[PDB]
Design a protein around this ligand. Structure first.
Ligand SMILES: Cc1cc2nc3c(=O)[nH]c(=O)nc-3n(C[C@H](O)[C@H](O)[C@H](O)COP(=O)(O)OP(=O)(O)OC[C@H]3O[C@@H](n4cnc5c(N)ncnc54)[C@H](O)[C@@H]3O)c2cc1C
Ligand SMILES: CCCCCCCCCCCCCCCCCC(=O)O
Ligand SMILES: CCCCCCCCCCCCCCCCCC(=O)O
Length: 563
């Protein structure tokens, strides 16, 4: 009742990060009728816009609330895996850190037309940096906002860097400068506009909601993609939910369909629609249009564990928790004043924006990413701690002062999978991250060795002046075997998730999409979101999604070509 006798040149399933990019570029003339279907509501929540309020988006209505299958290798725990549910997708619910990985992350992709040189310019193109001048590696005219964090903990941040210097690390002035090595300590830039989240709804879609050739439907939950037998012909969706009507959106001649549902829901929705492993499709009685075995495999996510240590009594009150909450748990009016009048202060911080990339065992590229947080976790699951920090408000307790080093396997060797658990196209998918399953035990070894690394840093002279013991894992956990068991019961997602519909060369039978993102054996079908990522880069995966999205967009409209 919303696409009524209307045929669209590009239907977009999903209204997230990449989808917000293409809608902008493809609606940019007037000849194309763009449609954008999004399960979740408009982007209007104040919790989206204030960075420190990220503590309220986890496990919230704006999250899909995905939980994984039992992971036997993880002491049989389900893993909560954050996924944004609103226009702007996970860009509106992320920690905003800006990371391209290294040039070798893209060279190693293998694919033709996506080397480090081919992608570099698409990055710069979409960037406007507040803190680096325009050059080979940074843009100034782009739609993304990028800035050095406008919050600084004058004691804990400076003691962290002195400490990482003590244990032998070198600084790194720009983790997205490919001319020098990617390892080292320093400061993560964040996709924020003067302390407001600079999500992709705000930077790309909100400035273009005027275009009459641009139709954006929130509340609109896609169920499948029409593929008359191969050619896609549209989508089916429901505006109310699993108890609503079964509408249909038709495409115009040549009208393509663009999978933007993200690394979790795209491979899922493709399967329900007929493209995937037949063995899995036959189990629920779904006709096979294409039998590509790569749909729903190769799921890569970066696992994390943490250490936590309180500060000495004498330095009580100097953590970021002390800057946001008072001793009674109420939000400080001073912090609100610095944020609303100046775009400064504790509320501009997602917390984890200082850190490092470290080689643990002479690897080609760093295997460990440390994230330092001048706040003290109260649960070894760092995601659950943020949820807890939210509910702590107004209870009347003082959150203890301290620090946290979150440790992350930024280039993991484990892979996962995304599958079908029901025929109900509104059911939670079969999600298995598969952390710690690589055949050499390397991911676990990277995380164990980060624990030793984190303890060295915390033992340094720079940090031992401020610290008083160790809460997590703590004094009991001494031997490697004990560290591993702690890692297993505390491993949490650092929220990347890539690869479930990977691109590859012609004759890559394991590949799903080709180097122009159209999928093997379907007409008018393309995938442009994090799923196409063939190897996860070394860093948080937001920025490369945009780069993919800006790239496909141009290619679609004949402004550049690949190969
Ligand atoms: C909590 C969190 C923290 C993160 N931190 C960082 C970080 O600091 N820096 C960074 O660079 N990256 C970070 N990431 C990752 C980054 O946000 C993602 O990699 C990126 O946003 C993925 O973009 P996408 O377009 O592939 O998917 P999304 O942005 O998720 O877009 C997919 C969209 O599809 C929609 N959808 C799903 N099913 C349907 C359906 N049936 N019908 C219609 N729409 C549907 C979803 O609602 C969603 O809006 C973080 C991720 C999370 C969750
Ligand atoms: C824990 C995050 C704090 C959020 C504070 C938002 C305050 C907005 C006042 C208007
Ligand atoms: C930013 C808001 C600051 C809140 C203080 C939170 C208490 C300590 C924080 C420890 C962070 C652990 C890493 C968690 C990252 C993934 C969620």
């Amino acid at each position: 009742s919303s696409p009524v006798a209307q045929k669209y040149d590009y239907i977009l399933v999903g209204g997230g990060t990449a989808a917000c990019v293409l809608a902008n570029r493809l609606s940019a003339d007037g000849s194309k009728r763009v449609l954008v279907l999004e399960a979740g509501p408009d982007n209007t929540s104040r919790d989206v816009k204030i960075p420190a309020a990220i503590t309220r988006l986890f496990r919230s209505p704006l999250d899909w609330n995905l939980f994984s299958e039992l992971q036997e290798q993880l002491a049989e725990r389900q893993i909560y895996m954050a996924r944004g549910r609103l226009l702007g997708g996970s860009s509106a619910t992320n920690a905003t850190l800006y990371h391209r990985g290294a040039a070798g992350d893209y060279d190693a992709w293998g694919v033709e037309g996506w080397s480090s040189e081919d992608v570099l310019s698409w990055f710069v193109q979409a960037e406007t940096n507040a803190d680096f001048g325009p050059g080979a590696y940074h843009g100034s005219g782009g739609p993304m906002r990028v800035e050095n964090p406008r919050y600084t903990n004058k004691q804990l941040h400076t003691a962290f860097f002195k400490a990482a210097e003590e244990v032998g690390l070198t600084p790194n002035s720009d983790f997205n400068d490919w001319s020098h090595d990617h390892a080292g300590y320093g400061t993560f830039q964040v996709m924020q506009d003067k302390g407001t989240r600079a999500d992709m709804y705000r930077q790309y879609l909100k400035p273009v909601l005027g275009r009459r050739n641009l139709q954006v439907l929130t509340g609109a939950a896609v169920t499948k993609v029409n593929i008359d037998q191969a050619q896609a012909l549209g989508v089916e969706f429901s505006t109310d939910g699993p108890t609503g009507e079964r509408l249909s959106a038709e495409l115009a001649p040549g009208g393509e369909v663009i999978m933007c549902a993200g690394a979790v829901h795209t491979p899922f929705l493709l399967k329900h629609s007929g493209v995937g492993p037949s063995a899995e499709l036959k189990e629920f009685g779904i006709p096979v249009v294409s039998n590509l075995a790569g749909v729903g495999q190769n799921l890569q996510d970066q696992p994390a564990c943490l250490t936590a240590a309180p500060v000495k009594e004498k330095y009580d009150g100097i953590a970021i928790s002390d800057h946001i909450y008072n001793e009674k748990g109420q939000i400080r009016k001073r912090a609100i004043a610095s944020y609303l009048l100046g775009g400064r202060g504790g509320l501009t911080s997602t917390g984890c924006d200082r850190g490092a990339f470290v080689r643990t065992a002479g690897q080609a590229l760093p295997d460990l990413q440390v994230r330092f947080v001048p706040g003290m976790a109260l649960d070894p699951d760092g995601v659950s701690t943020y949820v807890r920090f939210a509910k702590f408000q107004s209870q009347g307790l003082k959150w203890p002062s301290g620090i946290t080093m979150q440790l992350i396997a930024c280039r993991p060797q484990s892979t996962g999978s995304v599958g079908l658990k029901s025929a109900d196209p509104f059911a939670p998918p079969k999600l298995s991250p598969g952390y710690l399953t690589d055949k050499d035990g390397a991911d676990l070894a990277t995380l164990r060795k980060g624990i030793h690394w984190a303890r060295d840093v915390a033992r340094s002279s720079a940090l031992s002046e401020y610290l008083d013991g160790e809460l997590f894992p703590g004094s009991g956990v001494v031997s490697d075997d004990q560290i591993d068991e702690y890692i297993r019961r505390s491993i949490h997602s650092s929220n990347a998730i890539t690869g479930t519909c990977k691109m590859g060369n012609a004759g890559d039978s394991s590949s799903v999409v080709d180097n122009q993102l159209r999928v093997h054996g379907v007409e008018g079908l393309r995938v442009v979101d994090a799923s196409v990522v063939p190897k996860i880069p070394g860093g948080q995966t937001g920025a490369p999604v945009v780069m993919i999205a800006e790239r496909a967009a141009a290619l679609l409209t004949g402004k550049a070509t690949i190969g």
